[PDB]
Each structure stands twice: as structure tokens, then as C-alpha cells.
Amino acid sequence: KAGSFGDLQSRTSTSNDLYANTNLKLQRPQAGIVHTPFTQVPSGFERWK
Amino acid sequence: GLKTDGVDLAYMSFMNGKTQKSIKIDNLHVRTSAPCSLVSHHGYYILAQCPPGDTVTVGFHDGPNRHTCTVAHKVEFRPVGREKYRHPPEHGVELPCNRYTHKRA
Amino acid sequence: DLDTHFTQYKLARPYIADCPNCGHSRCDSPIAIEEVRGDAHAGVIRIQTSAMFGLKTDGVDLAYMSFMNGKTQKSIKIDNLHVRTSAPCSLVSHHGYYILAQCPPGDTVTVGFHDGPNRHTCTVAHKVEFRPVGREKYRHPPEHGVELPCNRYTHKRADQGHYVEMHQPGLVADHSLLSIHSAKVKITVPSGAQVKYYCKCPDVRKGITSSDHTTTCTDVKQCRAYLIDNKKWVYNSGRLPRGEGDTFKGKLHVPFVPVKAKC
Amino acid sequence: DLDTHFTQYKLARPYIADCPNCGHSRCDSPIAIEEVRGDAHAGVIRIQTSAMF
Amino acid sequence: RTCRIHEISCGAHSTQCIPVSWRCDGENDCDSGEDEENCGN
Amino acid sequence: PTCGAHEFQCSTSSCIPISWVCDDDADCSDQSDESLEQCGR
Amino acid sequence: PTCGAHEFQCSTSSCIPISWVCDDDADCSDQSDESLEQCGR
Amino acid sequence: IATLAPEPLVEHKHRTLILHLHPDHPTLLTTRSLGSDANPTRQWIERPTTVN
Amino acid sequence: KYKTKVPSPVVKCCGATQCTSKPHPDYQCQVFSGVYPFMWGGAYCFCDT
Ligand SMILES: [Ca+2]
Ligand SMILES: [Ca+2]
Ligand SMILES: [Ca+2]
């Protein structure tokens, strides 16, 4: 649910398959500079702590 | 910006007694709670971008002297919009605000 | 040895990228804060910049740093390299792109270094907080206290199984190498630079040259110029344009990895 | 006289005692902050150290 | 048209000539978009 | 007690890797990795 | 875009006063008021 | 330049809108209805919450 | 806790570019048209708007 506990789920600590839905949305760069902005909800594991 | 002989933006002048001294700006510091980064100076006025706090103090080194003056004025941070941020972001929404001008005119 | 860690960091160069609030008007700075990590248990943080610390043109020396002003990679002795958040932090170590410091809580992260009379400051807006260990919310680590397991960033540079990738730099645009010879613009190509160009003076006149190539057009404002330096690599920032073709997946260790310690 | 306030202070010397957090790792330093006193009414404090001024 | 044998015309509207090597480069050079098509796979 | 081939053993059964010796650091409690018999300073 | 007798036009409808010309500040994106030829420096 | 909040999570129901909001700064949410009476609400959201 | 990494953007700035769908957790693509960036040492490319 992107904000509570399963924003990032991994079967093992060294596993290669990752589940991740963090509502990552890209944003338009402004005023003629090269940078990549984005907006996303914070980590629910940090919120669960 | 004046050195008692013309116009030069790297110079300042003051009085120590009845003699109007003139030096070069070596360490002109403005701090509130953290050191601010000043923008411009013209005559009696200094423009600076300061963090919030309860005191405003400026100073300049003449020789080995200090020359500090600390006034007690409460300065806050005023965000624009419907979110209360504490430092202006890298990216977001351009919104109209009201700020002091960079230019001297 | 020092060069065992510094082996793959000799193969990379600093870069100039976008920094908000560098002075007062978000210029491009030689030192640019990207990805400051602040989730340790004593207020210690690890800051990654664009400059290179502890690396000369020849050998390695822990008091010398390297940065760029244009296209010339300039080395300078570290004299006043300061990191501050709301009070001046006390830095711990530096290796390559990365600085380590122990900071009080605040909302900004500021770095800077003097070379002559220059300042070279950068200020990013990252909320860094002090996280105590245990069931008491203290505000500074005490003289005497019960030992508890805290996770911190380590003091020593080593491989430790954490990697970042470097990449071949893309085209860097320089306008100071385009000058008019008599009435026609001329390209100055220094030391195998492979300078690209793109003219639209009556039409397209694109091409790649290696020396001279006096362009037969009039104005310097109607022709762009680039620069292809592939000798040294850079970390693929989000603030740099990518290369044209395939770019190799390099490797570079992170020096101050998170470990588990006692607080 | 200025010398009257230093008659018993000439017989004393500085010393090196430990203090936490010089840099990062709790040094032994000539400056060692002992007994900070802050019970005044305008934020003026008195700091006793190991050095001699 | 009627260019040299080392160059190929583009567009066939204004009779403008380009070298052959500028094929599928990703840049819209001519007025017509025939120069970015029929490139190699 | 013997460690692996990629570990340098200072004293008291604690060993550090070969990449960690002669590098101006205290990775052992006895400072054998920066002694005069190994680095030769 | 013809401006008045007390305004200086940089390029493409951008007018600033005459006191803003050659004063070590770029008030125009054309930067014509602080150019090499207009300032004479 | 002002900040932009993270996008809320919309969950629908029978005549009910459920919003899960995870702000990073104290952020204002004001609603109204487009009928004869607007019935306005106004609150500042500091913590991750949920409103119906 | 996650860590979102951003690759370097491509600036093909006379024309247009498209992406495939790489297999990555919460992968994002976008194309922004008519940016005209400004690096150090002048603007990046000639093609306006
Ligand atoms: Ca072509
Ligand atoms: Ca060692
Ligand atoms: Ca001006």
C-alpha cells in the first residue's frame, strides 16, 4: 500500500527479485537546467519505526 | 561601495573618531543563528539571506579589530503557498511572492 | 596500502553540476551535494559531492583535493573545507566523492572550500535529525552511559561489498573555444579534444573535427560547440547529460559503508 | 595591582586530562571542559578548563 | 538534384544535397522527414 | 590459529585482510599492521 | 516596440531606463546594455 | 518556488472517498461540496493520516 | 528503506526520443519536449523551442 509496511518487499536480503510501489512520479525540469526531479511518498518502513 | 575618492564595490568607509577611515571589505559577516550569505551592499544598506532567529548581528574587520553590533530583532521564515517548508526547494511550483530587489536603483 | 582503495578512484575525474543556492542564485558549482545520507544513530552523516578528495594528478595525498574550473582539472591543498548544518560540524574523513561528518540537527547541508580568494559554496535542503539510541531522548552523546548496539557509518575506507558505477562522460558544451579568425569563426581544439560542432548559418554543417577546421560562416552565435574527453570517467549523476552510444558499467566502491557498533 | 591577583597562580600549571569529542574519538587534550556554570540571568556563563590564560 | 556520386539528395522538394553518412542520426536536418527513415536495423 | 590466505593475522587470534595493511589505520589492537617490520617507514 | 525617450530597448520588447545601462548588472537576457561595444570597455 | 506534496492514495466506496495522505511538511487540505451548501472543511496535516 | 537511483538523462535536443520498458521495480519513463537547457559555458544546443 506504498506507505505502511510493504513499500519494499524482498524474499531474502541478497535476493534479486524486488517488489516496489512507492508512487514514483516524474516531474518536468524547469527554467533550462539538466536535472531529474521526482515526487514519491516516503518509506513506510521508516514510518513503521 | 565608497572609498572617499570615487566608487568601488570592494571598498567601505567608516569613522573612528573624527577621521573618516576607508578600508577594503575583507570579512563582512552577517549572522542570525547561522552565518547568512549576503547578496549586495549599497551605501547604508546590506541585503542578506538569513535563517530564522532572534538576533541580527553584522561586523567587519578593520585591522586586527572586530567591530561587532548585535541587535535583538525576531526574524522568521515565510513560505509561499499551502505547505510550510523550512528551506526553498530545488523543484516544485512557481508561485508569486514579494522579495527585496537585487538591483540598486 | 592507500593505492589498493585508490586504484579505481584514479580512473575518474571531478565534474561541474547544478547546485541550488550555490551563492544566492543557483549557479553551477565545482562541488555539488548529491545524496546525503542521514540515518545513523549518533548524528553522523555521509555526504557525496562532485569534487575529489585525497587524490592529486600523480599519486595520492590525504591533504590535497582536486576540482574543475572549466575543462582544466585543478588540484589545490585542502585548507578550510567546512561542513555545517546549523552549527559547524566536525568532519571525520574524506575519500573520493564522499565526505563524512558528525552534524547537529537542522534543515540545510552546506559545504565549501577556499582556494585563493574564492568561496565555492553549495547548500542543499535536507532534513537531518539526531537519532538517540534506546529509551531516552538525549540531545548529545554523553560522557558515561550504558552501551547499546547502534548502527553507524564506519571510519575506514575499504571495498566492503558495496559498489557504485562510473560512466564515460557525455558531450560537454564549451563556448570559449569558438572565436572569429578574421571574419569567419575558427575552432580551437586542444590536445586531442575531438571537438564537435553544429552550424545552422545557411543550413546544417555538422561534423566532428580533431584540429583547426576554420568554419566558413560568419557569427559565433549561430554555431554550437562541444568537447569529447574520454580519458577519465564520471559517476552517472542525474544532473549530467548521458553519452550517445552504449556506456560501460563501471564499478566503484563506497568507502564509508554502514556497520554495527556500540553507542 | 594586577600582580596581586596572580600570586598563587604562578605556582600552578596546565595539565592534560581527557574530554570527549575533540574530533570524533574522545581525545586527551590540553583543553578539558570541567564544571560549566550557567546560573546567571543573561546567558553569561563561566567555563573552567585545564589551560592557563 | 544531379549531385556528385558520393552524396544523396534529400526531400526532393527544394533539391538540397547531403552526404550519405547522415542516416537515422536522430536530427531533423531537411524540411521533409525522409532522412530519418529507412535506416539499418 | 590460522586464518585464510587473504587475511593478515596480527596477534590474539584477530586477523584483517591483506588489503588493510600498511594504510595508516589501526585495524588491530596491537598496531602490527603499521609497524616498522612491514611498512618499513 | 518603440519605447520612450528615457527607456533603452535591449531586444524583442524589453525596455529598461537609461540609468540601467552600463552599470555592472545584466538586466536583459540579450546582455546588450553591458556588451563590449555598447559599454565601450 | 514552493514545494509539492506527494500524491494521495484514493480509495472509493459507496458515497465515500477515502484519502491516505503521507506528507513531509505540514500541509493544508480544504474540501467543499458543489451543492446548495458547500459544508467546508479545513485542516493542517502534519502526520500520515486517513480521512473519509 | 529504499533508495531511488536516477540514471543520467539523454539530451537528443533536435528531434525526439522514446524508451522501451526495462524490467526494473517501479520503473518510470517520460519525455519532456522543448526544454532548452543551460549548462556551464553556454546553452547546450542550438535548436530552440
Ligand atoms: Ca540525418
Ligand atoms: Ca591498517
Ligand atoms: Ca544594467
Swiss-Prot record, chain B:
Palmitoylated via thioester bonds. These palmitoylations may induce disruption of the C-terminus transmembrane. This would result in the reorientation of E2 C-terminus from lumenal to cytoplasmic side. Signal peptide: none annotated. It is a single-pass type I membrane protein. It is found in: Virion membrane; Host cell membrane. Processing of the precursor of protein E3/E2 into E2 and E3 results in a heterodimer of the spike glycoproteins E2 and E1. Spike at virion surface are constituted of three E2-E1 heterodimers. Interacts with 6K protein. Plays a role in viral attachment to target host cell, by binding to the cell receptor. Synthesized as a p62 precursor which is processed by furin at the cell membrane just before virion budding, giving rise to E2-E1 heterodimer. The p62-E1 heterodimer is stable, whereas E2-E1 is unstable and dissociate at low pH. p62 is processed at the last step, presumably to avoid E1 fusion activation before its final export to cell surface. This is Spike glycoprotein E2.
From Swiss-Prot, chains F, G:
Coiled coil: none annotated. It is found in: Cell membrane; Membrane, Clathrin-coated pit. Glycosylated. Residues 1-41 form the LDL-receptor class A domain. Abundant in heart and skeletal muscle; also ovary and kidney; not in liver. Disulfide bonds join 3-15, 10-28, 22-39. Multifunctional cell surface receptor that binds VLDL and transports it into cells by endocytosis and therefore plays an important role in energy metabolism. Also binds to a wide range of other molecules including Reelin/RELN or apolipoprotein E/APOE-containing ligands as well as clusterin/CLU. In the off-state of the pathway, forms homooligomers or heterooligomers with LRP8. Upon binding to ligands, homooligomers are rearranged to higher order receptor clusters that transmit the extracellular RELN signal to intracellular signaling processes by binding to DAB1. It is linked to Cerebellar ataxia, impaired intellectual development, and dysequilibrium syndrome 1: An autosomal recessive, congenital, non-progressive cerebellar ataxia associated with disturbed equilibrium, delayed ambulation, intellectual disability, cerebellar hypoplasia and mild cerebral gyral simplification. Additional features include short stature, strabismus, pes planus and, rarely, seizures. This is Very low-density lipoprotein receptor. It comes from Homo sapiens. The lineage of its organism: Eukaryota, Metazoa, Chordata, Craniata, Vertebrata. The gene is VLDLR. The chain holds residues 191 to 231 of 873 of the full protein.
Curated annotation (Swiss-Prot), chain I:
Class II viral fusion protein. Fusion activity is inactive as long as E1 is bound to E2 in mature virion. After virus attachment to target cell and endocytosis, acidification of the endosome would induce dissociation of E1/E2 heterodimer and concomitant trimerization of the E1 subunits. This E1 trimer is fusion active, and promotes release of viral nucleocapsid in cytoplasm after endosome and viral membrane fusion. Efficient fusion requires the presence of cholesterol and sphingolipid in the target membrane. Coiled coil: none annotated. This is Spike glycoprotein E1. The chain holds residues 851 to 899 of 1242 of the full protein. N-glycosylated. The precursor of protein E3/E2 and E1 form a heterodimer shortly after synthesis. Processing of the precursor of protein E3/E2 into E2 and E3 results in a heterodimer of the spike glycoproteins E2 and E1. Spike at virion surface are constituted of three E2-E1 heterodimers. After target cell attachment and endocytosis, E1 change conformation to form homotrimers. Interacts with 6K protein. It is a single-pass type I membrane protein. It is found in: Virion membrane; Host cell membrane. Disulfide bonds join 13-45, 14-47, 19-29. Residues 35-49 are annotated as: E1 fusion peptide loop.
